[PDB]
Design a protein around this ligand. Structure first.
Ligand SMILES: Nc1ncnc2c1ncn2[C@@H]1O[C@H](COP(=O)(O)OP(=O)(O)O)[C@@H](O)[C@H]1O
Ligand SMILES: Nc1ncnc2c1ncn2[C@@H]1O[C@H](COP(=O)(O)OP(=O)(O)O)[C@@H](O)[C@H]1O
Ligand SMILES: Nc1ncnc2c1ncn2[C@@H]1O[C@H](COP(=O)(O)OP(=O)(O)O)[C@@H](O)[C@H]1O
Ligand SMILES: [Mg+2]
Ligand SMILES: [Mg+2]
Ligand SMILES: [Mg+2]
Lengths: 525, 73, 518, 520
């Protein structure tokens, strides 16, 4: 009939993309994201300079962080950002690898569906090739020793991870501090690593060489009432929660002083309360007092004249870390502070950080301290932030290696070996589905191509030559000589990737590309 | 990224080529040229004049406060 | 190790050009082969067209990308050179540009790709020449086969049985099939009039006029003596300023009588030569026909046709064998055109059409009149007839005939892949990409027909690998079969021109590295 | 003066009904491409920018903003089919639209709506009766065959979803989550917790209860995270310093009484904590917050605390361990504290999750499903809910029927045979009903990229006399015995789809005029 009928509210402005054009748009956005993430891959990659809406700038190479700050509007780009963030969450390394692999897989999928093949068939082929690749990756891996006695493989893995980041300026002490921190914090019996016990703290000034690992706790406070000594030797500490103030019940209360004698009694009660507080702090024998909630002038002076240094306003997590390091117990009231409830401190020192007024305390332990602290120093806020995120990457790699123990020899060797396995399997496969398998092989094999292109070498010829070397001599540890030291063999160059990291990369990218291929219709205002 | 699809937002942009390093280099060289005329015992100091509240005016030679007060983009 | 090539704008521009070309190719991909359905274009003004020819689709569609404009110029150049394949050439160019985008991504200089594409084209031309078979004229069967093949992918396909034989007869009745080396389509006048149906199209060996007879008393003439006129049958007037001064009352009578006598003299000289139908050239600045002149012509039982375009005089002279006169003293029967019959036919109330048929003098010219219900089918029918005529022109140009339905380009893909396998270096990948980017045509023919593209292309490659040449897609069978036995063939010039033009324009596109707004 | 308010728009007669029918087809076209194993996916962007990705009829139709009353009826039928049996939301919408499309030719001329409504009612009654009398029931009551039936039904449910490639991994999994439920099949007794990171096959079924780390204070990370035979103290009381009654006023006039009251508040808190500790429990849980003082108190005695747990998770812990929530602390007996084989706090994808696993008599479950994006795990949760709902419905009666369009073709053949004995015009309408019921295999073939007409003709020829249960085999591009191919569906989904589609078609047809007010 002549009358045009309206079914959907506000349907004159809504937009709809349907059929193959929508899939083309999806693949195109994914290709754009992958091309953006391609340059900053591998040791020769270059950083990216992200500025937020507030105008503050950060220079970073972490793909998950770059995509998270990428203020993007396309839905496929949002899915790619979520992919990168999830890969960061589960593993902590290879955040750009998943994005590049997904982009390559979607590009090959576009090439395939140009030939009129169903997207679900492409997804099934991708899944089969991912299974083959994961099986080959588990077959190819070898194990390292996670022990303090021979820690060197841990340094090798952390040094390989710390490559392609600015902290490779040092590249040796960073791996050492990461390995030591994770080894100290880790609970080896449960094979669990807690990241709340590694208080990664940074401060500008100095050099990147000054970044150390305190086997104790650093806190951004100072000794109250500065007349007290700026450092104490091995001291007994009293971690405390209640403030050094006269008590008051939580329930609302009224204390009627009905006479002058009542007034004098209240005065005497307050004064003797302070005096008894200090006396029962001193009687335990502790040299250092630490309070979470701060206190007043009389407490300061009584603490000073009793030769008992103290600090205040220490935060909750900082209180917990201090008590774990010193071995003491957090007590919420003065009346239950016994000798057993003190902690031990190797030495408590105050540091001034040059000409600035800022001060900090360092607590060093002479005994076993389950907690540590990584202190970062540098010449820029951007350097500090990049350094701490790079060290977080290293810690994540070390804990992943604690919980899995198996490694593969990266640098492109793993991808090339998986590609050969996928292609060899796809040889003996019935047609109409081997196309997806070969597309998967090429898509995962683009990673050495991008690595070589970032390294400055010709990608295709070098990649073909190293693949021929891998297939001639059964040495699946031949990768792109990105650093230009010769020796295509990657055993000698000591490059280590974690098995779970690579297998998670492959599986997660395959699942994301399957979801992207599944989408058909888009309705958006 | 110059592709015929735009994905960032109404206001977000990307420079992924020699344009980015061009902008960074010209900005850094502009800052350096701003500081350059205040070196040595024969250097001459500069005037920092506000464009707003209370119109703060300060005469200074060291580059720390010169770079802190001005608003770089 | 190597050049840093800090500038990235050239790469962005190259990828943008490749993407635009691929998009333009995909736009008309679904308008190829017998099963491809035509596009509908409506320009800024409310004028519409139903077009299946790629050149028309690309011209009417006002594109904005430089790669798209270069592609539309390529399509129109291919139409000019051959007249068929103006879709396949664009598809080939876009497809192999999309092939070379990954070559660019693989770290290959554009010059190497261009040179390797040139070498691949050089091999492919020889492959096509070997694949062909000689074709020679006076074999009406193969000419009808080529015409039907050219018309299959058009709306007039169901009329091809009553429209292809006349399409080839038009060409065979204009040029000598012994020593031609070329034909002209200018002397094939396609006249279109609205009304009727397609089955009412006609081919006339005579002459067709859309003009109207001035004297509505005479309609038909048997044994017509046609004579063109280039001067004017009105009151005399010199080239320079003309003036008549009257000073007496007898002078008005004298001037009226003298003008009447002059006109009557002219008409008497025209009539005494035996001329029975007159053709007056469309003249301006002087009335070609005067009412008194027309009255005298009607009195002497003559038929008059006036307002004839200047550019049509050559066509009329070549058709009916008459010679124009610009002076009355040279109007003689010795150089007066003759014809068996002149008729004015009313087209069932849709129009009035003038036919000069049975010209005794030889005529190296035919005229096609096309009929249709609405105007869109008439436009598409004349375009399809033009395509068939261009196909016959290709056959006349060079005598080489190849198979169709995907067979030539798939055989070319196989041969060129085998040639690339013996070209180790950085050009091996480029020749392989060129070879595998010419499978787009069989894939498009398969998917446009509802077939399975992957299996169809794979079975085609298998069939041509075993040497079973001239094997291609068949849409009547719905599969793959020998095409020659199915009577589908095309001249070799179309394929060779398409391949060469596409390769040259792709090399030109690859040479681009920057775009700047002027 | 005019009768109605200004701006009132009324439509009457045949054109209004035909426009309503066309609106029905247009709204059912939005979910048409989401059937069968080759089903595609729909992405809907809200006005807030959030995009939801799914391929079930109910969710897509709900997300679409519908203002046409007939399209509103289609939305309601999809949502009600979702709320009744859980699976078959796209089928009801497609069936309604196809009924209306098949009958619109007959409504173009002067056909009285009552007669076609009666034809629908008769056809649907016969169809439901045939489905009831065709579905096969094993009637053996054996655990192995019941498990196989539930696994196959769940596997068929997981097809046409995002979790297709892992059907077998998830299907049997959800069966276990329904095996370990009591004889009430409450849907709140199996929880779903979504966490970013990891592969799709990394998901797990906790037979006890798992929940995200709620909160912690200064004193956490000191009590041990591993107990090998603990007792769980489910609580509903906050253990922290606070006012006694939120209006209690303390009135004293001596400092001794003031100190006594301060010590009294501390003493009441410590006595409550001492009762909790002396109860013998090792790990304690509370809906109300747990203060830092109680955290340190339990840390000093190797006891785990966890405050501000959600209500549903605490009830799931009740159903797993077998305790009871005590608002009061004076009566921590020994038969009220639940016990579990193992308690353990672990790291899952950047979050801390508490696990109570190994409960011998568990009437609850927890789904730790992994994914790469929030929409990925949300769609996985949607598919899992579909599967658990279908298993929950099928557990009441194990009467199954072959899917893949086999049952639709069987009913179409039955109705075609029946609509030859009936004389008059009702024969044409019942034939239209059968031709409409013929839609599902055609749409499956279309989504799978088949030759739909050829496969339909093959099905009709092989199914007129060659045997029932024959549906479309997508992988083999052909027709196959879908019952012997283990594509099973409970008959209730088809029964409900047919009856709902008939009801919606009758409601749409039975309208002759519509009025729109100026919506003041
Ligand atoms: N010394 C090296 N030689 C060759 N390849 C390396 C080397 N170091 C790292 N790579 C490779 O670079 C790739 C990217 O590493 P990187 O950019 O540091 O972190 P991410 O994996 O998060 O992108 C890894 O897949 C690794 O195999
Ligand atoms: N009957 C047919 N069977 C199979 N293929 C055909 C048939 N007719 C034409 N083709 C193929 O369709 C292709 C396109 O031809 P057409 O659309 O007529 O002109 P253009 O080449 O300009 O697109 C040709 O390459 C030809 O091989
Ligand atoms: N393995 C299979 N083979 C063929 N058809 C199937 C298969 N699995 C499901 N189907 C068909 O898919 C239809 C249901 O599609 P689906 O999207 O899974 O649920 P919904 O009914 O909610 O749309 C059913 O009619 C069933 O016949
Ligand atoms: Mg890394
Ligand atoms: Mg043609
Ligand atoms: Mg379903």
């Amino acid at each position: 009939y002549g009358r045009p009928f309206l079914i959907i509210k506000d349907q004159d402005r809504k937009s709809r993309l349907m059929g193959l054009e929508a899939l083309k748009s999806h693949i195109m956005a994914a290709k754009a994201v992958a091309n953006t993430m391609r340059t900053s891959l591998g040791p020769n990659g270059l950083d990216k300079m992200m500025v937020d809406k507030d105008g503050d700038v950060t220079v970073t190479n972490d793909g998950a962080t770059i995509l998270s700050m990428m203020d993007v509007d396309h839905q496929i780009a949002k899915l790619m950002v979520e992919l990168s963030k999830s890969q960061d969450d589960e593993i902590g390394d290879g955040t750009t690898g998943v994005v590049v692999l997904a982009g390559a897989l979607l590009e090959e999928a576009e090439q395939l569906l140009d030939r009129g093949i169903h997207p679900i068939r492409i997804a099934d082929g991708y899944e089969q090739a991912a299974r083959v690749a994961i099986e080959h990756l588990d077959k190819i891996s070898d194990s390292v020793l996670v022990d303090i006695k021979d820690t060197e493989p841990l340094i090798q893995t952390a040094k390989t991870t710390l490559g392609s980041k600015v902290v490779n300026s040092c590249h040796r002490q960073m791996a050492e501090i990461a390995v030591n921190a994770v080894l100290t914090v880790a609970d080896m019996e449960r094979r669990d690593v807690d990241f709340e016990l590694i208080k990664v703290e940074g401060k500008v000034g100095g050099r990147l060489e000054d970044t150390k690992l305190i086997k104790g706790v650093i806190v951004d406070k100072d000794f109250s009432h500065p007349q007290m000594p700026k450092k104490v030797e091995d001291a007994k500490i009293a971690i405390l929660t209640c403030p050094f103030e006269p008590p008051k019940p939580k329930t609302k209360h009224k204390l009627d002083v009905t006479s002058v004698e009542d007034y004098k009694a209240l005065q005497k009660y307050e004064k003797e309360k302070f005096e008894e507080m200090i006396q029962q702090i001193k009687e335990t024998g502790a040299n250092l007092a630490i309070c979470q909630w701060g206190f007043d002038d009389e407490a300061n002076h009584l603490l000073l004249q009793n030769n008992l240094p103290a600090v205040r306003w220490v935060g909750g997590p900082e209180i917990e870390l201090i008590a774990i390091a010193t071995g003491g117990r957090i007590v919420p009231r003065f009346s239950e502070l016994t000798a057993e409830k003190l902690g031990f401190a190797g030495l408590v020192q105050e540091i001034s950080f040059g000409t600035t007024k800022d001060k900090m305390l360092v607590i060093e332990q002479c005994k076993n301290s389950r907690a540590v602290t990584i202190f970062i120093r540098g010449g820029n806020k951007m350097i500090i932030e990049e350094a701490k995120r790079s060290l977080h990457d290293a810690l994540c790699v070390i804990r992943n290696l604690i919980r899995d123990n198996r490694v593969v020899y990266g640098g492109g060797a793993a991808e090339i070996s998986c590609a050969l396995a996928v292609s060899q399997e796809a040889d003996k496969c019935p047609t109409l589905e081997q196309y997806a398998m070969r597309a998967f092989a090429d898509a995962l094999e683009v990673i050495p191509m991008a690595l070589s292109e970032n390294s400055g070498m010709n990608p295709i010829q070098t990649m073909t030559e190293v693949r021929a070397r891998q297939v001639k001599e059964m040495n699946p540890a031949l990768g792109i000589d990105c650093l230009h030291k010769g020796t295509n063999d990657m055993k000698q160059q000591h490059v280590i990737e974690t098995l779970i990291g690579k297998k998670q990369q492959i599986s997660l990218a395959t699942q994301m590309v399957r979801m992207i291929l599944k989408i058909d219709d888009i309705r958006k205002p | 990224s110059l592709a015929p699809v735009n994905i960032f937002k109404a206001g977000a942009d990307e420079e992924r080529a020699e344009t980015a390093r061009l902008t960074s280099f010209i900005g850094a060289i502009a800052i350096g040229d701003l500081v350059k005329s205040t070196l040595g015992p024969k250097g001459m100091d500069k005037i920092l004049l506000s464009s707003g509240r209370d119109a703060s005016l300060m005469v200074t030679n060291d580059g720390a406060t010169i770079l802190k007060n001005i608003g770089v983009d | 190790k190597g050049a840093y090539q800090d500038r990235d704008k050239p790469a962005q521009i190259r990828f943008s050009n490749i993407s635009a070309a691929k998009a333009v190719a995909d736009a008309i991909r679904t308008s190829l082969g017998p099963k491809g359905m035509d596009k509908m274009i409506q320009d800024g003004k409310g004028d519409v067209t139903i077009t299946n020819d790629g050149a028309t689709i690309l011209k009417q569609m006002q594109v904005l990308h430089p790669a798209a404009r270069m592609l539309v110029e390529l399509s129109k150049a291919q139409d000019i050179e051959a007249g068929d394949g103006t879709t396949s050439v664009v598809i080939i160019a876009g497809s192999l540009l999309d092939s070379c985008t990954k070559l660019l991504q693989k770290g290959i200089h554009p010059t190497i790709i261009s040179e390797s594409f040139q070498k691949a084209l050089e091999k492919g031309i020889e492959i096509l020449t070997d694949m062909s078979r000689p074709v020679e004229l006076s074999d009406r069967e193969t000419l009808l086969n080529s015409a039907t093949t050219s018309l299959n992918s058009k709306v007039v396909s169901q009329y091809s049985s009553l429209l292809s034989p006349m399409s080839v007869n038009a060409v065979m009745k204009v040029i000598d099939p012994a020593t031609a080396t070329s034909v002209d389509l200018r002397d094939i006048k396609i006249v279109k009039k609205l009304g009727g149906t397609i089955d009412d199209c006609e081919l006339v060996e005579g002459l067709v006029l859309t003009q109207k007879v001035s004297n509505s008393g005479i309609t038909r003439v048997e044994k017509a003596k046609i004579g063109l006129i280039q001067f004017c049958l009105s009151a005399p007037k010199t080239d320079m300023d003309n003036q008549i001064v009257v000073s007496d009352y007898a002078q008005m009578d004298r001037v009226l009588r003298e003008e009447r006598a002059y006109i009557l003299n002219l008409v008497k000289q025209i009539k005494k030569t035996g001329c029975n139908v007159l053709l007056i050239q469309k003249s301006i600045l002087r009335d070609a026909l005067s009412d008194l002149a027309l009255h005298f012509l009607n009195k002497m039982k003559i038929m008059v046709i006036k307002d004839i375009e200047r550019e049509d005089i050559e066509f009329i002279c070549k058709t009916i064998g008459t010679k124009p006169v610009a002076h009355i003293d040279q109007f003689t029967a010795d150089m007066l055109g003759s014809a068996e019959l002149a008729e004015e036919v009313n087209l069932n109330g849709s129009g009035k059409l003038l036919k000069i048929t049975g010209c005794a003098s030889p005529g190296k010219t035919v005229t096609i009149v096309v009929r249709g219900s609405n105007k869109l089918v008439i436009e598409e029918a004349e375009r399809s007839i033009h395509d068939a005529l261009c196909v016959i022109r290709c056959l006349v140009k060079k005598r080489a005939l190849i198979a169709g339905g995907g067979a030539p380009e798939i055989e070319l893909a196989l041969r060129l892949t085998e040639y690339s396998r013996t070209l180790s270096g950085m050009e091996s990948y480029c020749v392989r990409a060129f070879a595998d980017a010419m499978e787009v045509i069989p894939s498009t023919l398969a998917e446009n027909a509802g077939l399975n593209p992957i299996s169809t292309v794979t079975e085609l490659r298998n069939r041509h690998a075993q040497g079973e040449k001239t094997a291609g897609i068949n849409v009547r069978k719905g599969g793959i079969s020998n095409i020659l036995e199915e009577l589908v063939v095309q001249p070799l010039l179309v394929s060779v021109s398409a391949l060469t033009l596409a390769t040259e324009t792709v090399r030109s596109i690859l040479k681009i590295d920057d775009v700047v707004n002027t | 003066v005019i009768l109605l308010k200004e701006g009132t728009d009324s439509s009457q007669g045949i054109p209004q009904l035909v426009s309503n029918i066309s609106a029905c087809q247009v709204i059912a076209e939005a979910v048409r491409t989401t059937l069968g194993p080759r089903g595609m996916d729909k992405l809907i962007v809200d006005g807030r920018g959030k995009a939801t990705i799914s391929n079930d009829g109910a969710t897509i139709l709900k997300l679409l903003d519908v203002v046409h009353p007939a399209a509103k009826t289609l939305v309601d039928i999809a949502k009600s089919q979702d709320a009744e049996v859980g699976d078959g939301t796209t089928s009801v919408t497609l069936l309604a639209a196809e009924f209306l499309k098949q009958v619109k030719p007959y409504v173009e001329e002067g056909l009285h709506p009552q007669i076609i409504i009666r034809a629908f009612r008769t056809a649907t009654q016969l169809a439901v009766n045939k489905i009831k009398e065709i579905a096969v029931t094993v009637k053996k009551a054996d655990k192995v065959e019941q498990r196989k039936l539930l696994e196959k039904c769940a596997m068929t449910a997981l097809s046409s979803k995002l979790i297709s490639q892992q059907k077998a991994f998830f299907a049997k999994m959800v069966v276990d989550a329904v095996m370990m439920l009591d004889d009430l099949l409450q849907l709140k007794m199996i929880g779903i917790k979504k966490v970013q990171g990891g592969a799709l096959e990394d998901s797990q079924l906790v037979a006890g209860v798992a929940f995200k780390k709620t909160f912690s204070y200064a004193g956490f990370e000191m009590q041990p995270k591993k107990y090998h035979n603990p007792k769980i103290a489910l609580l509903n009381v906050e253990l922290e310093l606070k006012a006694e009654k939120d209006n209690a006023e303390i009135r004293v006039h001596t400092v001794e009484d003031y100190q006594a009251i301060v010590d009294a508040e501390w003493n009441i808190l410590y006595d409550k904590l001492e009762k909790i500790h002396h109860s013998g429990a090792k790990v304690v849980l509370s809906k109300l917050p747990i203060g830092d003082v109680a955290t340190q108190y339990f840390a000093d005695r190797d006891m785990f605390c966890a405050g501000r747990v959600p209500e549903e998770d605490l009830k799931r812990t009740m159903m797993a361990c077998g305790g009871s929530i005590q608002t009061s602390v004076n009566a921590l007996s020994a038969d009220v504290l639940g016990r579990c084989q193992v308690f353990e706090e672990t790291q899952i994808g950047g979050e801390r999750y508490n696990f109570f696993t190994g409960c011998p008599k568990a009437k609850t479950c927890t789904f730790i499903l992994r994914g790469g994006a929030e929409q990925f795990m949300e769609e996985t949760e949607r598919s899992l809910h579909d599967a658990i709902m279908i298993v929950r419905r099928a557990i009441k009666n194990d009467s199954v029927v072959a899917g893949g369009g086999a049952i639709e073709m069987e009913l179409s053949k039955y109705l075609r045979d029946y609509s030859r004995t009936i004389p008059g015009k009702q024969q044409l309408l019942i034939g239209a009903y059968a031709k409409a019921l013929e839609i599902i295999p055609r749409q499956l073939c279309d989504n799978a990229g088949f030759d739909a007409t050829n496969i339909l003709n093959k099905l009709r020829a092989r199914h007129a006399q060659g045997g029932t249960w024959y549906g479309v085999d997508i992988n083999n591009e052909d027709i196959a015995d879908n019952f012997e191919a283990f594509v099973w569906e409970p008959a209730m989904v088809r029964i409900n789809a047919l009856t709902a589609a008939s009801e919606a078609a009758c409601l749409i047809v039975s309208v002759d005029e519509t009025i729109k007010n100026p919506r003041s």
